[PDB]
Tab-separated table of C-alpha atoms and ligand atoms in Angstrom:
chain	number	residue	atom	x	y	z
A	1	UNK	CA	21.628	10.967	11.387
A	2	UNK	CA	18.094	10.171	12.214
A	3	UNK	CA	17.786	9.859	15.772
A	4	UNK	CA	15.475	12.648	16.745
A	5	UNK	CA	17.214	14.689	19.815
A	6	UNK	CA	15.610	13.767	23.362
A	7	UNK	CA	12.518	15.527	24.108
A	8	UNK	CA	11.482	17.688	20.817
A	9	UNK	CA	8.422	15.594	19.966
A	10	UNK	CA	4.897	16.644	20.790
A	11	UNK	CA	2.297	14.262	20.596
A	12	UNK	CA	-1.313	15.888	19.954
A	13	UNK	CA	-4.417	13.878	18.567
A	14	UNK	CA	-4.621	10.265	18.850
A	15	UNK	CA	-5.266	9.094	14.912
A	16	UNK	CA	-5.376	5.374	15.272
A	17	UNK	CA	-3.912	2.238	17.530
A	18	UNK	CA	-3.723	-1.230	17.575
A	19	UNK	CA	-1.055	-3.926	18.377
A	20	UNK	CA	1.700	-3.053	16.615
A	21	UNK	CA	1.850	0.734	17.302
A	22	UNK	CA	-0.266	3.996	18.171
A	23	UNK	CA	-0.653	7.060	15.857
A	24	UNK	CA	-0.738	10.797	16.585
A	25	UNK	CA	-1.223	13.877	14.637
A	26	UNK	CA	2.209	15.540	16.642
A	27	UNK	CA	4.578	18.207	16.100
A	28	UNK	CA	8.404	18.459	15.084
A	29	UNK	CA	9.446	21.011	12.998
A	30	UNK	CA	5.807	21.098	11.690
A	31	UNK	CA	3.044	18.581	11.439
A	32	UNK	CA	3.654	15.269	11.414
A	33	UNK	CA	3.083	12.049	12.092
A	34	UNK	CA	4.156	9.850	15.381
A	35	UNK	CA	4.372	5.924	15.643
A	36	UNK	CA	4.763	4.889	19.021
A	37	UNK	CA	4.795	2.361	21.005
A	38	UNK	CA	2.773	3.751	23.946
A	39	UNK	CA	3.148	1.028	27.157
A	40	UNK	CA	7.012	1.241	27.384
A	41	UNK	CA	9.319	-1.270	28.917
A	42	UNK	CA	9.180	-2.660	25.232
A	43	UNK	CA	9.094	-6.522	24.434
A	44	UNK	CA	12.482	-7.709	22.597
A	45	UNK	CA	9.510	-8.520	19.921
A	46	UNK	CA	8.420	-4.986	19.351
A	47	UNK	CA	12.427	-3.796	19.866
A	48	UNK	CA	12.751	-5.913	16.671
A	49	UNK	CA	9.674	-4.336	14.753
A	50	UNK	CA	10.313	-0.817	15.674
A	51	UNK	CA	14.242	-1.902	14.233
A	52	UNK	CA	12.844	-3.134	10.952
A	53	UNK	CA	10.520	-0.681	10.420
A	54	UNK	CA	13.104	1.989	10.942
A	55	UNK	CA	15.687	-0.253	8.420
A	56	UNK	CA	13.347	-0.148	5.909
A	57	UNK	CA	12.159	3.338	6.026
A	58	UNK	CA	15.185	4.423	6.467
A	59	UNK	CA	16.291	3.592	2.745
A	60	UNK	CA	13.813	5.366	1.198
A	61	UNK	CA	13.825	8.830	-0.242
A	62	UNK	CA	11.062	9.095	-2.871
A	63	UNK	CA	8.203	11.224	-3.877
A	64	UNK	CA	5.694	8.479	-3.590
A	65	UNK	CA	6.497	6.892	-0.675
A	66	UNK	CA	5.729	8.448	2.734
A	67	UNK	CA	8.507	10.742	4.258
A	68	UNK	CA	10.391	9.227	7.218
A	69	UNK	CA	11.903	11.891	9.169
A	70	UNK	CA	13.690	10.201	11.918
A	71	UNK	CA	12.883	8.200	14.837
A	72	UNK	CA	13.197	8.675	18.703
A	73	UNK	CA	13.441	5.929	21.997
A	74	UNK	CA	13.561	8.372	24.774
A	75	UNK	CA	11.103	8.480	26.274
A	76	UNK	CA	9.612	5.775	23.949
A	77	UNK	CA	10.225	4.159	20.835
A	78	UNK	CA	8.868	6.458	18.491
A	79	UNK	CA	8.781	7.209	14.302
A	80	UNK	CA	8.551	10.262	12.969
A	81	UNK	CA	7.271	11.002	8.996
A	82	UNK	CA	5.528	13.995	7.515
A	83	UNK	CA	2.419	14.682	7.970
A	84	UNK	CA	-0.322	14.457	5.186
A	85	UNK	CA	-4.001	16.254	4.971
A	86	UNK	CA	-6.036	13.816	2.556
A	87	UNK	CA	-7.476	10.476	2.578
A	88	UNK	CA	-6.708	7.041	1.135
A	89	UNK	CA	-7.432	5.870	-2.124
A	90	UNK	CA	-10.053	2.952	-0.496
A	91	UNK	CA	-11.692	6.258	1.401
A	92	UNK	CA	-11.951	7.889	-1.744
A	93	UNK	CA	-13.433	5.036	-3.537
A	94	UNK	CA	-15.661	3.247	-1.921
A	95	UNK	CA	-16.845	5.722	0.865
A	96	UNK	CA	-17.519	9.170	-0.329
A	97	UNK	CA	-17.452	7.644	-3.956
A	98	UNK	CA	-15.592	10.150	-5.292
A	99	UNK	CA	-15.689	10.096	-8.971
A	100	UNK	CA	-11.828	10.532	-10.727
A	101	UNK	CA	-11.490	11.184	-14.409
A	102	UNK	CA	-9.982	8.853	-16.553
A	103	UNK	CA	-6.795	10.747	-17.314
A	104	UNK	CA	-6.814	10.749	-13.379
A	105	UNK	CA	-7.433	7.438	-12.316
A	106	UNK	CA	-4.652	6.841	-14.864
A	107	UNK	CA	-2.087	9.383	-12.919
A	108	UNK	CA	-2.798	7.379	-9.807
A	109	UNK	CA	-1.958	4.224	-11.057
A	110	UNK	CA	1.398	5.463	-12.752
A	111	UNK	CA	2.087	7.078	-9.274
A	112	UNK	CA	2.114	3.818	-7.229
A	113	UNK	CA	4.235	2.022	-9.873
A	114	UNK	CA	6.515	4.892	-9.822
A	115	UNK	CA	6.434	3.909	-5.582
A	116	UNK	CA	6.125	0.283	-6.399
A	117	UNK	CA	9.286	0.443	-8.630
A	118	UNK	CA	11.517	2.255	-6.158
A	119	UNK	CA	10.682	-0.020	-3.282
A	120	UNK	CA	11.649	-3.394	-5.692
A	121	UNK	CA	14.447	-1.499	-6.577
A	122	UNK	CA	15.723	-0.926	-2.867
A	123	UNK	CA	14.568	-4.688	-2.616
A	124	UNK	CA	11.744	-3.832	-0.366
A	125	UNK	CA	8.370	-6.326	-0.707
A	126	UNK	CA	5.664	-3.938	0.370
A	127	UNK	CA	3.715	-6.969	1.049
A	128	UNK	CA	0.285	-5.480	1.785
A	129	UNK	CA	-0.272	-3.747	-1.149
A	130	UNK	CA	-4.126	-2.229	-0.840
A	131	UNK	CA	-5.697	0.796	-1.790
A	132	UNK	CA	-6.123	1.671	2.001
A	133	UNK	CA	-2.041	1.814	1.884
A	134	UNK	CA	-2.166	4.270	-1.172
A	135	UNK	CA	-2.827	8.092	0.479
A	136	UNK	CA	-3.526	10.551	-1.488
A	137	UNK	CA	-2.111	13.785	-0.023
A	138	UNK	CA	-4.308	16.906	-1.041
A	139	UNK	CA	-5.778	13.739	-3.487
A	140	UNK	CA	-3.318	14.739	-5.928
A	141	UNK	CA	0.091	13.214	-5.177
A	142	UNK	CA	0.462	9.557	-4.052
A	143	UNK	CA	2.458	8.107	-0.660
A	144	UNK	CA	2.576	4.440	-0.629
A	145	UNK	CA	3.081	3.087	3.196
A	146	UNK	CA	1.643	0.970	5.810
A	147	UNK	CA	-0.682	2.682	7.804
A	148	UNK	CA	-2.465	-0.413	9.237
A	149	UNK	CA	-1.674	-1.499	13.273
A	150	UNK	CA	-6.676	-10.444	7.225
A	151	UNK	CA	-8.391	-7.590	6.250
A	152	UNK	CA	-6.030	-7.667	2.811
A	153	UNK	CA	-7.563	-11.032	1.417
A	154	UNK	CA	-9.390	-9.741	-1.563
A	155	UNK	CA	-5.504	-8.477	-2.624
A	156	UNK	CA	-3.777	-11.719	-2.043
A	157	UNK	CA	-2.493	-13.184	-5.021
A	158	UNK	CA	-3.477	-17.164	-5.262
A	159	UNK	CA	0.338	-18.067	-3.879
A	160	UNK	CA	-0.086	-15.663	-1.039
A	161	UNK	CA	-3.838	-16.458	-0.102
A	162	UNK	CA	-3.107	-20.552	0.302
A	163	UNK	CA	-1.310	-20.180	3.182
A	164	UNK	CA	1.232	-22.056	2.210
A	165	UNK	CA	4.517	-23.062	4.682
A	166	UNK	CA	7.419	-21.832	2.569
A	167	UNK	CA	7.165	-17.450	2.426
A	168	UNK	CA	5.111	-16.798	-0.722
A	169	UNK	CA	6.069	-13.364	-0.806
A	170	UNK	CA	7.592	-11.522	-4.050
A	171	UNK	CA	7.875	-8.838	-6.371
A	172	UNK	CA	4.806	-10.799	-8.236
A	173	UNK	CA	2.805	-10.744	-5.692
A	174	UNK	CA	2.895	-7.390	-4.546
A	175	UNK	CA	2.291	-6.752	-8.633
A	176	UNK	CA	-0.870	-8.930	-8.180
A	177	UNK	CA	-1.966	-6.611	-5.650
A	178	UNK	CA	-1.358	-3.499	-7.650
A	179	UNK	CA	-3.649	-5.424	-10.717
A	180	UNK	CA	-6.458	-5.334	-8.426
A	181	UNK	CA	-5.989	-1.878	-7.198
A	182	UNK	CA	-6.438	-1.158	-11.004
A	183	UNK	CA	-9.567	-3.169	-11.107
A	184	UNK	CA	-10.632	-0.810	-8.077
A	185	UNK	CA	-9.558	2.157	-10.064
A	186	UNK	CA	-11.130	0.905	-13.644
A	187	UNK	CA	-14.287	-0.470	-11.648
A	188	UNK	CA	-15.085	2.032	-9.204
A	189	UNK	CA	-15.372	-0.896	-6.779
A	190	UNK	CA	-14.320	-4.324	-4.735
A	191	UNK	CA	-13.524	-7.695	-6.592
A	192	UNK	CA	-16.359	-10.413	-5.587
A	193	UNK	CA	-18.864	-8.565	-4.270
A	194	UNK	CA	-21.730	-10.998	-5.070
A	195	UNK	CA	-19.815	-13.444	-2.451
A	196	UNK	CA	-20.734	-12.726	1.268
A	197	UNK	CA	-18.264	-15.543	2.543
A	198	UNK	CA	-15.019	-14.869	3.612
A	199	UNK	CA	-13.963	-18.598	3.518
A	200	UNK	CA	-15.474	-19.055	0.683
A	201	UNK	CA	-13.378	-16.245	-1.268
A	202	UNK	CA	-9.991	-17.504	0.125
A	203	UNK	CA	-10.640	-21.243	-1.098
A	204	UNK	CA	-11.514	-20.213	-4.289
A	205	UNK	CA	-9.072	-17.630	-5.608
A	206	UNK	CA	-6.589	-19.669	-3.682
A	207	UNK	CA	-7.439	-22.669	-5.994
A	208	UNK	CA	-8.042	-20.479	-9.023
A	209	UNK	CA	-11.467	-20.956	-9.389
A	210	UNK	CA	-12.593	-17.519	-8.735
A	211	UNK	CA	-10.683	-14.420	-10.675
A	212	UNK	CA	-11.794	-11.003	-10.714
A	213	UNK	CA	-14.601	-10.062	-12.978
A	214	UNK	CA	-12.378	-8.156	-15.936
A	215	UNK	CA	-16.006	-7.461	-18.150
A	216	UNK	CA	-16.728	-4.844	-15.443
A	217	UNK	CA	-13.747	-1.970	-16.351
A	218	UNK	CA	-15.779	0.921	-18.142
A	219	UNK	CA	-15.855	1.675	-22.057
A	220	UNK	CA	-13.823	4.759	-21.595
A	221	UNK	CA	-10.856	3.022	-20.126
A	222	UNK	CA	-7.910	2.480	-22.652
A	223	UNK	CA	-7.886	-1.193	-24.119
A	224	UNK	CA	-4.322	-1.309	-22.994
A	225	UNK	CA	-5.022	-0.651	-19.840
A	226	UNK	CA	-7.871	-3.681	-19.360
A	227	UNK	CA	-4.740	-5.310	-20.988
A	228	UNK	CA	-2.181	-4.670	-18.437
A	229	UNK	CA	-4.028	-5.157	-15.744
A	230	UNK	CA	-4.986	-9.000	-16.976
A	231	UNK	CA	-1.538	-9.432	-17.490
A	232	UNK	CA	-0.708	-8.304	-13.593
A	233	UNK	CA	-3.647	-10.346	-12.257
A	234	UNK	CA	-2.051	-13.530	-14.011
A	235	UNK	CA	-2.207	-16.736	-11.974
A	236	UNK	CA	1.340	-17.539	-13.008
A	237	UNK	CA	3.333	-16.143	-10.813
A	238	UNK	CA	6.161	-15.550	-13.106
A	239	UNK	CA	4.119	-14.127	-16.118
A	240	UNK	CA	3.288	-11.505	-14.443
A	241	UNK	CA	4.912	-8.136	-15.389
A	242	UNK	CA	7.446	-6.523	-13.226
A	243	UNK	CA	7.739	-2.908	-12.123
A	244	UNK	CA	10.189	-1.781	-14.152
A	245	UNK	CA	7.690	-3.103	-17.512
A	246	UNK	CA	4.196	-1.554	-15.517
A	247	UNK	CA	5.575	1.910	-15.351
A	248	UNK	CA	6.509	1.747	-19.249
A	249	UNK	CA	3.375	0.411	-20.031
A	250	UNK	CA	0.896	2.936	-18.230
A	251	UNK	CA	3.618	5.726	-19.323
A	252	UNK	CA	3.086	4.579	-23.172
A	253	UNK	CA	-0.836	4.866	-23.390
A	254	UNK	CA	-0.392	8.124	-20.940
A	255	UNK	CA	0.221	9.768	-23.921
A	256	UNK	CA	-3.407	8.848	-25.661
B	1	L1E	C1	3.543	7.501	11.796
B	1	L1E	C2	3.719	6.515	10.649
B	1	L1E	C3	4.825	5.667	10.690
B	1	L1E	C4	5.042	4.750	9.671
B	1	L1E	C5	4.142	4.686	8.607
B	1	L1E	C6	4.332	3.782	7.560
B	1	L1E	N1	5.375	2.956	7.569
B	1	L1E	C7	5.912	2.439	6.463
B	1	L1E	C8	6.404	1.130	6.521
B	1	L1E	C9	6.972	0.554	5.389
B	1	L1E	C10	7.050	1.293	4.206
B	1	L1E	CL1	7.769	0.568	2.812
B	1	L1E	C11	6.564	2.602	4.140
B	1	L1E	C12	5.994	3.174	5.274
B	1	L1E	N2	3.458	3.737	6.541
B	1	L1E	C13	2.401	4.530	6.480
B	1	L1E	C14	2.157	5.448	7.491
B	1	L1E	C15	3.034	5.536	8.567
B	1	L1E	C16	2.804	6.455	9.585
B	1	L1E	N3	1.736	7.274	9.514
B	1	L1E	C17	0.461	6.883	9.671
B	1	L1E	N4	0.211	5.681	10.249
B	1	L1E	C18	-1.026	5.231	10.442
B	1	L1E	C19	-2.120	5.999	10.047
B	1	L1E	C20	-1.915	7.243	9.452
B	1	L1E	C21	-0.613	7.718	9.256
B	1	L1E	C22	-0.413	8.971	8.633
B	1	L1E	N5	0.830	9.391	8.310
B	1	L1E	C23	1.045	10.561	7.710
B	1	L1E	N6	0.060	11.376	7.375
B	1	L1E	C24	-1.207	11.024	7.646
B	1	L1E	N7	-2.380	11.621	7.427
B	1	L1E	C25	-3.356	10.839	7.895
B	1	L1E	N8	-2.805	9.741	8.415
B	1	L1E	C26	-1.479	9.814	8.284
């Protein structure tokens, strides 16, 4: 069971905060990580989010998706997962510019499908798909999560990004979102750059008018790839390629 006993956790350097939760580098058989909720006395609002968060992560046990450990609520609602020395994929590319081989940027992409896949398959909608949500531990193996607490617009399919009333949520979007962490990947950079209004970007992707910029993916990258990655960026929400087909796609041209 994965209620941590009372009074093992050690909280040690404050990471990040916000809203919804506050972060700590802690210990617990080890480094890890520690989501708490720090003023306790706990809304029946954040009860419910520290009980779906837990009911989610709870169901997964995969290599590319961040390790839950357990979870604690004495003294406070806390969550428990490993701990990982690296940075995110965004970090990587469009901070310290770090420049990936090919047959690299390739691995990475095959590694959050792999995650991708698992999650659909456990019927989990990630949701906020971004490459800020892709770590990359010791920038070798890939952990999918959620380590924010409107700054995911530019990976908002069209359904998603209009705002509409009925939940526009689905395993196509969240594949949408993975076709334009390719583009970041192929590109080395950010869709729409040129446009310095965020309004602006919403109203037109939203009504199709705008589309990432597919002329931009280097020479060296594998036609089938450029491919692929049209096909997941597809305005159609149903054309757009599952998980199950992604993986066996990137795994195919792995192989040139
Ligand atoms: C303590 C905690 C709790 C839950 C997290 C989480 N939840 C989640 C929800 C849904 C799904 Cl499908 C998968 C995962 N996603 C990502 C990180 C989570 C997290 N950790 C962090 N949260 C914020 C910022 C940094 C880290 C963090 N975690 C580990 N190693 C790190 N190394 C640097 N930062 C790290």
């Amino acid at each position: 069971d994965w209620e941590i006993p009372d009074g093992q956790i050690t909280v040690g350097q404050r990471i990040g905060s916000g809203s919804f939760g506050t972060v700590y580098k802690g210990k617990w058989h080890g480094d890890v990580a520690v989501k708490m909720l720090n003023v306790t006395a706990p809304t029946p609002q954040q009860l419910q989010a520290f009980k779906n968060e837990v009911g989610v992560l709870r169901k997964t046990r995969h290599v590319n998706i961040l390790l839950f450990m357990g979870y604690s609520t004495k003294p406070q609602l806390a969550i428990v997962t490993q701990w990982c020395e690296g940075s995110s994929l965004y970090h990587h590319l469009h901070i310290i510019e770090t420049k990936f081989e090919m047959i690299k940027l390739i691995d990475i992409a095959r590694q959050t499908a792999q995650g991708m896949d698992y999650l659909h398959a456990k019927s989990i909608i990630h949701r906020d798909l971004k490459s800020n949500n892709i770590f990359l531990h010791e920038d070798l193996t890939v952990k999918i999560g959620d380590f924010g607490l409107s700054g995911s617009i530019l990976w908002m399919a069209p359904e998603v990004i209009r705002m509409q009333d009925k939940n526009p949520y689905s395993f196509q979007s969240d594949v949408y979102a993975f076709g334009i962490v390719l583009y970041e990947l192929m590109t080395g950079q950010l869709p729409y750059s040129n446009i310095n209004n965020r309004d602006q970007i919403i109203f037109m992707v939203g009504r199709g008018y705008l589309s990432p910029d597919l002329s931009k993916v280097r020479s060296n990258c594998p036609k089938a790839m450029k491919r692929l990655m049209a096909e997941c960026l597809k305005k159609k929400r149903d054309e757009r390629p599952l998980f199950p087909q992604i993986l066996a796609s990137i795994e195919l041209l792995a192989r040139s």
